[PDB]
Every structure is written in structure tokens, then in C-alpha cells.
RNA sequence: GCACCGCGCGCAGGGGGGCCGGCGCGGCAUCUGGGAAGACUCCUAAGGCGCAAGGGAAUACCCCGUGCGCCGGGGGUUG
């Protein structure tokens, strides 16, 4: 409740990094008498390898490893709740193939591969789920693909243009996330933030916000605020424009960090709405949301 | 259904139909189910593209057996009318089979395209 | 510790290390009905004649490695003893079939694999008519 | 002239310009899929000079995965006449007949094939040879033929699925003996068609090794096939 | 560039295709009276935007890109109404949009005509796109395969009774089509009708005069009389 | 064209049979070990003209059969280009004798 | 690390190696870590690093 | 083994290192060259191409104006 006490540090070895972190929290189970068993929360990570690691916070070391024959995993996420005991991780990677791992009953194993891109030069850099069965992935070849997890099919390939600010024509969608009403918010290599329609999968807005590329996004739990953190050490806050629906605009920006803002995540509960942004200056900055 | 190496990505479908149109201008193409079956049986065929919009789908299902016996890659595009006017036919073509030769930029495109089909499989 | 073993012919039970009892069968076309009855987990006469004791449940245990068969025979009220699923029970149901040469002088002093072959042919041709030709 | 090879149950036929592999036909006077066969007698019949007793079916390595391993330098095949082999992926009864002729009448080969047309030809082959039993079931579901398959000695595995090591893993946890044998044929263009095949094969060997096999050897099938490996390994010993 | 544009029929707006292809084309929409940017409509394709057309009430616009994706994009909600696909088009070249008494929420134009690079021009009744949901695979009212080269021009009559579509790359490749019957007129053009290599066509405001201008630089005029 | 197609089918069957016979006549193998000790023990255990003539003969037969199949395949391709050059309408395919490649972009109506 | 393989000329004898990662973490691929940086610094150059120093 | 009044040299090879310099394989945001390339673009010109004969030669290469065809330019009023 505003104390921010650092409890445990579990260090990895030499030549070992951590790129993505995902908690998997089960829903509230109920006993025979009306007592509440809360969700057991398991921590998964990737380390710029082909291996998803599950961490044991009780023993303060790594619990499990899983790996399939594919490239290095660059982004992953846990499928949201609509099933109940059958939840699955979806992981994008370098060479393209969206691998899909299974987690149930204390297990982490490489289940299958949904699809892969035709072009071998498509690298998957960010992933976010719109619903239980629709996965929105950003790619390096200027696309935001929207796959469907059950059959593994492809709903639509959203695209973005060249960057006309410098060279290097391929834009890179560094962070996608999904609003609660269905829209998709995506920060990319131009420092833009695009608002994509949820039903049609076309863009509805381009908001030029940053100068260098937007590296991480965060979306409020009720869908009212968007926080964008870029490589120009800049954090920008957007609220919807009054009147027309689906139109966002940048309320204000400020440079909170001293290097780029590589990751941030939000929390809103028990009288505490924060968003914690960690960058490359090792200082996690907590903003009130 | 029975069309399991389906080409659903529109970028890959556009690449397949562009290579079909280039082979059609090179006269390196066999159009139709019977001519496709003849090219696959004779073994001159480098890649074979079937169409999944066939109304009885079972009239092109014999070609996966001969391609499994002869180790050539087959792939399914969505629309037979698109395949037809990709070849330049003004009819609906349900199966097409594009062949190989000694040295071509088209042969390099064929090798890359069957690599992409093997990525689908 | 009642274990439930199903071979192609009959069942065995090793509760007290060493084998305790059995149930034998041979050479009928109701063997494929037994086979389908454990493809689902339905009522089975050999199952019921095995699990029918007269006293009570004396300790609620029946070790069957497939969870589907376990929670389909949980629902039967004929004996109301509740079974257990495969709690990584590899050692039991692997060692009994590797050391099943010890069992063969007990219930069926013979070689019963010809009806195993016949049931395999019957099931495979049943599925080949399920994909009819 | 016919000699037995180093592998028991496998024969070679030698001539002035050729060297062929062959097996001892369990049904003499009968061929299966159009294969050449040689009639040889044991010596002691000079006045008659009729090749009466032994009929040998020529094993074709261009249609067999296992026969491409034996001519490649497979040190052991883990099976002798009288063993028990589970054949995973029995495509229309091509190699499983030669494996049945290897294991003989006191051996038995359990063929598993999910695909229905190859199941049709497999059962129409398997009617004659009684030492095979065919199972038309998905190999990714071993509890559907757990009643039908007893404990085996060797698992042969030629199935074109990307979770080939997982199929081998569940079938070996349910059917292979302690210290058993595994001969698996790995297809790189089936598992990952973009990586180097050495890397694909090394990842599959590592998956078996964490799946509690012991990789003894790996050899490529590359005068006969393209980008195919054969891993010969033992189970728990 | 500013080469390709379309002014709205109400005269208030004007849309310009932005020269940025990269697997999907956008077009910037400009208020006519003040010459300022007011919107932008982006569609996904392979080479961008083949053509587009404003709706008849003047709000939205239908953008037919290359590789067959056609997109109805409204001006009121300022996002995409829907996306459908031309039947079997390996790549679109031109589009036109006309008639009256169409669907009320899709601009009130009845017919859309999309001509591809093979030579085939599909004509769809726009009351068949509504399944606001658009059908992802509508069927054409009529597929015209009379011209053999890529369809370069297409133009509806302003009262929505004629449709003239022509290819530039053949001498005298122009056809004239009745609506709603979708029948090609067979009595004109004849073998000796001096069309030339047709580069632009234009129907009159009362639709009494067809003007055809060729690659030589000669306009010729034809009274339409029914 | 029909005659060249039948001769090409016969010659392709001959090439397949001859290549099968040549392979049957004449970092490949990897053996794994648990440790350097077992590897060195196996290395201790490793420390403990007719075919040339007939294989050169089969190699010369294989090269002549490949030349024959390549010649018949080039003949069949040249005849398909002759069909394209003599079609009743303008069909793409083949080079002119000046060297410029024929490509017509009309559709077959 | 791992002992390098020894080739007789036909076959290759190699020690298996998985003794690097017991329970700790898998070692990050330096080729993939430098690729994500090269997507972050595309054509852009660094500013001069420190103060007055050679 | 050579010098038993000496360093060192000729040679077998066991392991690890400087991972210094090359080679091979793989990815590589861009940049450079080539091919293909959009059909508004180029398509060599008001003509060209093909097939089959005929005639001549630097005799491997080619050139020229008869019979069938395929386009193109120009001209061109609901045939």
C-alpha cells in the first residue's frame, strides 16, 4: 500500500539476461464451506533463448525449462480468461513461428506451433491478446498480424507505412496492447501510437507523440488512460477526446527517466492505481495512474 | 477439412499467384487437373498449386497421393477463379503445376517458393 | 490396494507384491464389446464381477491409470468404492506387464495372444468400415 | 552367393558387380509390393541343382528407412529373431514385412498406422503374415491400444509428425522395456525446414536425452534420402 | 505527388492518395474550402491504392486497393465501415461507383464496378454487400471478360444507366454497358468507330454526351440518345 | 512433341534405375559417449580394383544417361515454345531471333 | 565448456554435454541479443561518451 | 638420440590457451551492383515477329526477297 519493499533477489548467471516476465494467476477457487482459495501465481520468463523458464519463488531458483525446435523467443504472453484449468502461453520468436506452450497441473511443455510467416525475415517483437482466442502480434516487417489461436488462422494483417524521418523503410511495432472495449493500441518505430479498430482491424488514429521509437505501452484497467514510454526517455499520457468516440489525444508528456523506458506495467486495486516503469537507468519509477 | 497445407496468408497467396503468372508468361506452366496430373506423374513438375474453392473438393484429391509418392510440394490457394485469371485463362482453373528447367531466375523463384511451402507444412 | 489391470483376455489384482486374484475370458465376439466398453468406460460384466464384493468398501482405493476410466467408473453405484487416477503410476503398471510372465501360470496357463491378434484385426477392420469402402 | 550379415536375421547377396540386402521370407512363394526375390538351397543337392528351400526377398533401401540405416553403418539394430518390435508409422506394410521376417515366427511386430489407406493396405498385407498385428489408431494416443500392445524390446519410429519425440516418449513410457532399444528416423524438413539439419538433429537428440534415453549413435541417410537422420539409442541403460 | 485525387460530389472534401506504397496505401483527406488536412484513410494491400471513389451523398469513400481488397471508409465515424474482396482479382486497377437508390448507410450509390489488371471488370450491386456488417465475399452481379488487356478507364453515367469501361493498351478497346441489366451493347463501337487508344472518358452532366480522348490527343463526342 | 515425351519417359525411367544401381554399388556418422574416458576407451578399441573398374563403368553409364535425359528435356521445352510461337492467338514464351523475349500481356478470351 | 569432437575421418566421436545448466537459467544467445539492439540503433550513432579523456 | 666438461636441435604426440590472422556456415536495420519488375511508364519502328520452303556464303556462327499465320502504326460516323 505504497511501501514498495524489495523482498527477494534471484540472480541469474553470467551471460544471462531476462527479457520478458509474465505472471499466470488462476481465478478464485472456493472451498466446501465458502472460504476462498486465491489464485496460485506462477512466474515465467524468457532469457533471449529458445527456452521459457518457470521460476520457483519458494526455493528462490528456476523451477522448470521448456524449449522447442524454433528460434529465440522474443515475446510471450498468457492467454486471458473467458479455459478454467486449461490456460496456454503463446510465444512469438525470431524466425516467425508462433509456438504455443501448455501450462496445467504444474507443467510447462512445448505443445505445438500455431503458424509461421511466409517470409523468413519476419521477427515477432511484441504480443498481446484481444480476447480468449485472438492474438495480436507485432512484427519487424511493418505489420501487426491478428491470428486466431484455436485453428491457428489469420484474421487480418494490419500494416504500417515506411518511416519517412530517416532511412530503414521497415517500421518496427515495438509494443502492442489491447483496450477493454476491443481496440488495439500500438507504439512503433516512428514514435507513433496507432489506435486500431477492434471489429474491423483497421487503424482509426495515428498520434505522433515521440521523437525516437515508442518502446513500451500501458493501458488502464478501465480503459481510460494510455501511458507510452519511448527511447527519447519520454513518457506520454493520453485520455480520450471528449465528444467523438475512439479518438485519443496526448494530454501531457514528461521525461521521468534518464535513459530509455524499456518496460512498464500497471496495477489498479486495493486503493492503489500505479504504473511502474523500468528503464535502462535501473530506477523503477512509480507513477500514480 | 481435407485441404490441410492451406495457404491462408495473403502475402504468400500473392507471391504464389505472381510466380504462377511469371511461369505462365515463360510457358513453364501446366493448367488444369488432367495436365497437372500428367506433369506430376511424368515427374517434370517442380511445384503444384491446387485450389480449395472446388465445389466437389474430391476431384483434386488424387493429386496429393501422387505428390506424396513423387515428393513434390503441393499447396492450396483459396480461390480457383483467382488461380484461373492468374494463369491468364478466363476460366476457373482448379489445379496448376509449374515446372522447372536448367537455369532461370524463375527456377530460383521456384526454389524459394517451395521453401516457403515447406515452411507451411 | 486393489489395482485394475486390463489385458486382451482378463484382469489381475496384486494387492498383497504378489498377485491376489484374477478374471479370465477367451474367444468371443463380445470381446470387442469389452474393448469398446473400455474405449469409453461404460458398464462391463467382467469389471462388475471383479469389483462385486459383499462386505463394504474397506478402504476406498482402486488404482487405474487413465483418468477417464477412473471418473467414469466413479459414477457407478453398484459398489460405491471410489477409484484413483494415474498419480504418475508408471512403476506399477509397467512392472506388472514386464514381469507378467510370473502371472501366466496363475490364471491362464497358456499363450493367449491369438485372441489379442483377433481383437486387433476386428477393431482395425471396424475402423476401416467406420471409414467405409 | 548369399551370406548372413553382421546383423542376425539379415542376409546379403554378393555377385561380381553388385551387393544387395535381403531377408528370409516367412511366406515362401509370395511377394508383397513387387520386390525381387532369390531362391537358394542349402548345399548337398548337386545331382538335382534345384533351388528349393530358402526364398529371400530383396530389401530396398530406397523405399525402406531401416534398410538405409543398415547399409549406412548401423552398428546394432537391437532386434534378433524372437524379439518384440513396435513399429510406429507403418506406411502400407513396406518395411514392416521385412521387420517381421527379421523377428521370425517367435517374434511379433506390432504395426501402428493412423492413416486409413495405408491401414487398408497394411491389413491386407497383415492377413498373410500372422506375426504382425495391425492397429489403425493415432500414435499420439497410446491408451487406445494399451490393451492390444504388450511390452516390447525395440521401438522403430518413422512417423512424419513434428512431435515425433513426444510420440516416442509416451509410447516408450507405456510399452518399451527397461534397457530397451529405439531406432528413430528424424526428418528435418518435417520438424524445422529453415534451421540447419545438424541443429535440428541435435535438438531432437537432446529431447530424447532429457526424455531419458541414452543416445548411442546417430547417422545420416544421405546416399539414399535427403536430410534424414537415424538415431539408434538405448532406453535406461 | 498530387497527381491522383477525387473531389467529393458535395464539393466539401477532396482525397489525395499519398505516395507511400509499402504494403498498404493511405490517402489524406482535405477540406476544399480551406485546403487543410482533415482526415486520413489507410488500407492494407500489396502496392497500395488502385483507385477510390467518394460516395454519392458525399460522406464516405470506397477505396479499392491492389490485390483485391476493397474498403468502405466512412467520414462520420472516420474509421472503416468494412472490407470485402473482389472475386478472384489478382490485382485491381480501377474502380467506379454510381447509380442511385443504393444502401442508405453506404452512401446511396447502387453499383460498384472494379476492373482488374487481367482485363476482367466485375460489377456488384451494393445492396448485396450488406449482410453495419459487410460480406467478406460478395458475388458479382456480372463479370465482364470482353476486354483482354488491363482496364484503364471506367465511368458511370451520372443518372446511373450506362457504364463505359475501356482499356488503353488496345486500339478501340472501349465497351458500353446498360444498367441494371448488365448487358454489353453490341452495336457500338463498331470496327470503324474512331476511338483510338482510349485514355480518358467523360459523360456529360445530363448524360447526353460521351467524350472519349485517346493517346494521340484528340477528343471525340457522341450523343447518347436512348 | 508426343514422340519426344515418350522417349523422355523411357529415358527418365532408365536414369532412375541406373542411379539406384550406382548408389547401391557405391561428418556422416556420430557416436555419442558420456565422457572423455569412454571416448578414449573406444579410441583404444579403434586403435586395436574390381570395384574400381565396375564403379567407373557405372559412373560413365550414369553420366551418359543424364546427358540423354537433359537433351530430351531441352527438346520437349523447345517444342512447347514452338507451340507457343505458333498458337492461333498471341501467346508469350520464347525469344525472337533478335534476342528480345516475347511477352504479350493479353488474356485468352 | 564442452570437449571438442574427435573425427577418425569417417565418424565423429563426441562427448554429450548438458552439464552447463543444472537448475540456474539458460545462457542468453549473444547473436539474438545483438540483433534486438541492431533493431534499436538502426543508422543512429552514439553521442561522445565521457568527459575529458583519451 | 646427438653434448656425461652444457644450452639447444631431429622426432612421436597427451591436453588446454592467445580464442591473434584466414576459411566455412548463419542471421544482417540499412547501403552497393545485377536480374525480374507496376501495365500511365519499356515494347528499339512505321513496321515487326513466327512457321515452312527457295537462293547465297566467313561452312558451327549468318544474310536475302515465296506460301501460310500472329500482332502493331496510320486511317477510320449507331457494322
Swiss-Prot record, chain F:
Function: Involved in nucleolar processing of pre-18S ribosomal RNA.
Phylogenetic placement of the source organism: Eukaryota, Fungi, Dikarya, Ascomycota, Pezizomycotina
Gene name of the record: UTP11
Segments of skewed composition (Basic residues): 98-109
Organism of this sequence: Chaetomium thermophilum (strain DSM 1495 / CBS 144.50 / IMI 039719) (Thermochaetoides thermophila)
Residues of the full protein shown: 109 to 270 of 270
Recorded family membership: Belongs to the UTP11 family.
Region spans: Disordered: 88-109
Subcellular location, record wording: Nucleus, Nucleolus
Protein name: U3 small nucleolar RNA-associated protein 11
Highest taxon of source: Eukaryota
Subunit description: Component of the ribosomal small subunit (SSU) processome composed of at least 40 protein subunits and snoRNA U3. Interacts with snoRNA U3.
Residue ranges, compositional bias (Basic and acidic residues): 36-48
Amino acid at each position: 500500500n505504497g511501501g514498495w519493499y524489495q523482498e527477494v533477489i534471484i540472480p541469474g548467471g553470467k551471460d544471462r539476461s531476462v527479457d520478458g516476465l509474465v505472471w499466470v494467476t488462476d481465478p478464485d477457487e472456493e472451498m466446501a464451506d465458502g472460504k476462498i482459495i486465491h489464485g496460485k501465481s506462477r512466474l515465467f520468463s524468457i532469457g533471449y533463448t529458445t527456452t521459457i523458464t518457470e521460476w520457483d519463488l519458494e526455493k528462490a531458483r528456476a523451477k522448470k525449462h521448456a524449449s522447442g525446435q524454433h528460434g529465440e523467443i522474443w515475446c510471450f504472453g498468457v492467454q486471458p480468461l473467458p479455459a478454467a484449468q486449461n490456460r496456454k502461453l503463446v510465444a512469438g520468436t525470431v524466425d516467425g513461428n508462433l509456438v504455443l506452450y501448455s501450462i496445467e497441473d504444474g507443467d510447462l511443455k512445448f505443445q505445438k506451433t500455431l503458424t509461421r510467416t511466409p517470409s523468413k525475415k519476419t521477427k515477432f517483437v511484441s504480443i498481446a491478446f484481444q480476447s480468449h482466442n485472438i492474438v495480436i502480434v507485432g512484427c519487424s516487417n511493418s505489420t501487426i498480424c491478428a491470428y486466431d489461436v484455436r485453428t491457428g488462422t489469420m484474421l487480418r494483417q494490419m500494416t504500417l507505412g515506411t518511416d519517412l524521418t530517416g532511412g530503414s523503410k521497415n517500421i518496427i511495432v515495438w509494443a502492442v496492447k489491447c483496450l477493454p472495449n476491443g481496440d488495439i493500441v500500438s507504439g512503433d518505430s516512428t514514435g507513433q501510437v496507432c489506435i486500431w479498430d477492434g471489429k474491423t482491424y483497421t487503424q482509426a488514429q495515428r498520434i505522433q507523440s515521440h521523437t525516437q521509437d515508442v518502446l513500451c505501452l500501458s493501458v488502464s484497467a478501465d480503459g481510460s488512460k494510455i501511458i507510452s514510454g519511448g527511447m527519447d526517455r519520454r513518457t506520454a499520457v493520453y485520455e480520450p477526446m471528449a465528444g467523438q468516440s475512439g479518438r485519443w489525444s496526448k494530454v501531457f508528456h514528461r521525461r521521468y527517466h534518464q535513459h530509455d523506458v524499456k518496460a512498464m506495467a500497471s496495477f489498479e486495486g486495493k486503493g492503489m492505481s500505479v504504473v511502474v516503469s523500468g528503464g535502462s537507468d535501473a530506477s523503477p519509477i512509480v507513477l500514480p495512474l | 477439412s481435407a485441404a490441410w497445407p492451406k495457404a491462408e496468408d495473403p502475402a504468400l497467396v500473392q507471391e504464389l499467384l505472381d510466380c504462377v503468372q511469371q511461369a505462365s508468361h515463360y510457358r513453364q506452366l501446366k493448367k488444369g487437373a488432367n495436365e497437372t496430373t500428367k506433369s506430376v506423374n511424368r515427374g517434370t513438375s517442380e511445384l503444384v498449386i491446387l485450389a480449395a474453392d472446388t465445389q466437389p473438393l474430391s476431384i483434386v484429391l488424387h493429386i496429393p497421393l501422387i505428390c506424396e509418392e513423387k515428393n513434390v510440394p503441393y499447396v492450396y490457394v483459396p480461390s480457383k477463379v483467382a488461380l484461373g485469371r492468374a494463369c491468364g485463362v478466363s476460366r476457373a482453373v482448379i489445379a496448376v503445376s509449374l515446372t522447372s528447367n536448367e537455369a532461370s531466375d524463375l527456377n530460383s523463384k521456384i526454389r524459394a517458393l517451395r521453401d516457403k511451402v515447406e515452411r507451411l507444412a | 490396494l486393489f489395482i485394475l489391470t486390463e489385458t486382451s483376455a482378463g484382469y489381475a489384482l496384486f494387492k498383497a507384491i504378489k498377485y491376489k486374484e484374477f478374471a479370465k475370458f477367451d474367444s468371443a465376439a463380445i470381446a470387442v464389446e469389452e474393448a469398446s466398453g473400455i474405449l469409453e468406460g461404460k458398464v462391463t460384466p467382467k469389471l462388475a464381477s471383479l469389483l462385486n464384493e459383499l462386505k463394504d468398501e474397506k478402504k476406498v482405493t482402486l488404482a487405474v491409470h487413465d483418468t477417464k476410466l477412473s471418473n467414469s467408473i466413479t459414477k457407478l453405484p453398484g459398489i460405491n468404492i471410489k477409484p484413483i487416477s494415474g498419480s504418475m503410476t508408471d512403476d506399477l503398471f509397467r512392472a506388472i506387464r514386464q514381469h507378467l510372465y510370473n502371472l501366466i501360470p496363475g490364471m491362464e496357463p497358456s499363450n493367449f495372444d491369438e485372441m489379442n491378434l483377433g481383437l486387433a484385426h476386428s477393431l482395425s477392420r471396424h475402423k476401416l468400415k467406420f471409414s467405409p469402402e | 552367393i548369399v551370406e548372413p550379415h553382421r546383423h542376425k536375421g539379415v542376409f546379403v547377396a554378393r555377385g561380381g558387380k553388385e551387393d544387395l540386402l535381403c531377408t528370409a521370407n516367412l511366406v515362401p512363394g509370395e511377394s508383397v509390393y513387387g520386390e525381387k526375390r532369390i531362391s537358394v538351397e542349402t548345399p548337398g543337392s548337386g545331382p538335382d541343382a534345384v533351388a528349393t528351400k530358402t526364398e529371400y526377398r530383396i530389401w530396398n533401401p530406397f523405399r525402406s528407412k531401416l534398410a538405409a540405416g543398415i547399409l549406412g553403418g548401423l552398428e546394432t539394430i537391437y532386434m534378433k529373431p524372437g524379439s518384440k518390435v513396435l513399429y510406429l508409422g507403418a506406411a502400407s506394410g513396406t518395411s514392416v514385412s521385412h521387420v517381421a521376417d527379421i523377428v521370425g515366427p517367435t517374434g511379433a511386430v506390432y504395426a501402428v498406422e493412423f492413416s486409413h489407406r495405408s491401414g487398408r493396405d497394411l491389413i491386407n498385407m497383415a492377413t498373410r503374415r500372422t506375426n504382425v498385428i495391425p492397429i489403425v489408431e493415432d500414435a499420439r494416443k497410446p491408451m487406445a491400444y494399451r490393451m492390444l500392445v504388450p511390452m516390447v524390446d525395440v521401438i522403430f519410429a518413422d512417423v512424419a509428425q513434428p512431435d515425433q519425440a513426444r510420440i516416442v516418449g509416451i509410447n516408450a513410457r507405456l510399452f518399451l522395456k527397461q534397457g530397451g532399444g529405439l531406432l528413430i528416423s528424424i526428418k528435418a524438413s518435417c520438424i524445422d525446414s529453415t534451421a540447419p539439419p545438424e541443429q535440428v538433429f541435435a535438438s531432437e537428440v537432446q529431447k530424447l536425452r532429457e526424455d531419458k534415453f541414452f543416445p548411442k549413435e546417430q547417422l545420416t541417410l544421405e546416399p539414399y534420402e535427403r536430410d534424414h537422420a537415424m538415431v539408434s539409442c538405448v532406453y535406461l541403460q | 505527388t498530387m497527381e491522383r485525387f477525387r473531389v467529393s460530389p458535395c464539393g466539401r472534401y477532396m482525397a489525395l492518395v499519398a505516395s507511400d506504397k509499402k504494403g498498404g496505401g493511405m490517402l489524406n483527406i482535405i477540406n476544399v474550402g480551406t485546403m487543410q488536412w482533415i482526415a486520413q484513410a489507410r488500407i492494407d494491400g500489396r502496392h497500395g491504392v488502385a483507385d477510390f471513389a467518394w460516395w454519392s451523398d458525399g460522406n464516405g469513400l470506397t477505396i479499392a486497393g491492389r490485390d483485391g481488397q476493397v474498403t468502405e471508409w466512412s467520414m462520420i465515424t472516420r474509421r472503416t465501415v468494412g472490407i470485402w474482396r473482389d472475386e478472384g482479382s489478382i490485382g485491381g486497377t480501377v474502380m467506379a461507383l454510381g447509380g442511385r437508390n443504393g444502401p442508405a448507410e453506404l452512401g446511396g450509390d447502387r453499383w460498384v464496378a472494379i476492373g482488374s489488371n487481367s482485363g476482367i471488370l466485375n460489377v456488384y450491386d451494393r445492396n448485396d454487400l450488406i449482410e453495419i456488417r459487410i460480406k467478406k465475399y460478395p458475388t458479382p452481379t456480372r463479370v465482364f471478360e470482353q476486354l483482354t488487356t488491363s482496364i484503364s478507364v471506367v465511368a458511370f453515367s451520372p443518372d446511373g444507366q450506362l457504364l463505359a469501361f475501356g482499356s488503353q493498351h488496345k486500339k478501340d478497346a472501349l465497351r458500353l454497358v446498360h444498367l441494371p441489366s448488365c448487358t454489353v451493347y453490341r452495336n457500338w463501337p463498331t470496327e470503324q468507330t474512331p476511338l483510338g487508344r482510349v485514355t480518358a472518358i467523360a459523360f456529360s452532366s445530363k448524360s447526353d454526351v460521351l467524350a472519349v480522348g485517346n493517346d494521340v490527343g484528340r477528343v471525340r463526342l457522341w450523343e447518347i440518345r436512348g | 512433341l508426343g514422340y519426344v515425351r515418350t522417349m523422355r519417359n523411357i529415358a527418365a525411367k532408365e536414369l532412375k534405375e541406373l542411379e539406384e544401381r550406382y548408389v547401391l554399388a557405391g561428418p556422416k556418422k556420430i557416436v555419442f559417449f558420456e565422457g572423455v574416458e569412454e571416448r578414449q576407451q573406444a579410441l583404444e578399441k579403434q586403435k586395436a580394383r574390381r570395384k574400381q573398374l565396375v564403379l567407373e563403368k557405372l559412373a560413365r553409364k550414369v553420366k551418359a544417361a543424364r546427358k540423354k535425359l537433359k537433351a530430351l528435356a531441352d527438346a520437349e521445352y523447345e517444342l512447347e515454345l514452338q507451340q507457343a510461337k505458333m498458337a492461333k492467338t498471341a501467346t508469350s514464351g520464347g525469344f525472337t531471333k533478335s534476342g528480345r523475349r516475347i511477352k504479350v500481356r493479353e488474356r485468352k478470351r | 565448456k564442452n570437449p571438442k569432437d574427435k573425427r577418425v575421418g569417417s565418424t565423429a566421436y563426441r562427448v554429450v554435454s548438458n552439464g552447463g545448466d543444472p537448475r540456474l537459467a539458460p545462457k542468453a544467445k549473444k547473436q539474438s541479443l545483438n540483433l534486438k539492439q541492431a533493431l534499436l540503433r538502426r543508422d543512429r550513432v552514439a553521442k561522445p561518451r565521457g568527459g575529458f579523456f583519451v
